[PDB]
Symmetry: C2
Subunit: 124 residues, 2 copies
């Protein structure tokens, strides 16, 4: 793959939890979009079940014609960091969920996946 980031989204789309999990350094953290920190930190031992939960969610939204769309990573002037814009979309194009990941890489592995998403609310 053209980067570990590409490898990660490849494996996840295919449901290869173990392949996606191995993209992360042993000292990596996945900083989820929601929690008390604010957000929520997952270490490498906890990321695999997160990936399991996400794979469960993925095929149930797919079972309703939803598509998850992950854009090409665009790197920062720091070549070990990149953003990935992403969305979850109904078959008719309606955006259900939209977010951005800030990746920090090290030694060809993911060191940080910092996840953000728009909060769907009645009013901003």
């Amino acid at each position: 793959a053209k980067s570990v980031i590409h490898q990660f989204f490849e494996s996840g789309a295919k449901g290869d939890v173990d392949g996606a999990w191995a993209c992360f350094a042993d000292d990596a953290v996945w900083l989820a979009s929601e929690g008390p920190e604010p957000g929520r930190t997952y270490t490498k031992t906890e990321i695999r079940d997160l990936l399991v939960q996400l794979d469960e969610m993925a095929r149930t939204v797919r079972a309703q014609g939803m598509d998850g769309v992950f854009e090409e990573p665009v790197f920062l002037t720091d070549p070990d960091k990149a953003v990935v814009e992403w969305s979850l979309r109904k078959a008719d194009g309606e955006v259900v969920d939209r977010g951005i990941d800030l990746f920090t890489l090290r030694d060809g592995k993911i060191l940080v996946k910092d996840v953000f998403r728009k909060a769907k609310l009645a009013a901003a």
Copy 2:
């Protein structure tokens, strides 16, 4: 300023609402971090009142001893895009709010400010 993104944040830190607003192109959008879209689209005519609101909230959080930190913008390999990481911290340093802006520029103006934030507890 080092860039129009720098000018926006410096103008805002200086309470210059009109100077910050002027950084946006007339066809710019501010894609807010919450709302039904998901998020919420504000056009250039609506952005000024958002800046007035944020100026007041900044003064309020400061009086409660909180600290807003906006990191140096980092451009992408596409030089018309950049991220700014930001956070809001309690006096001691506890983070109560954390986010990131993805900027799109055109001809020296802000065209898109796409705002994201963590959802708390």
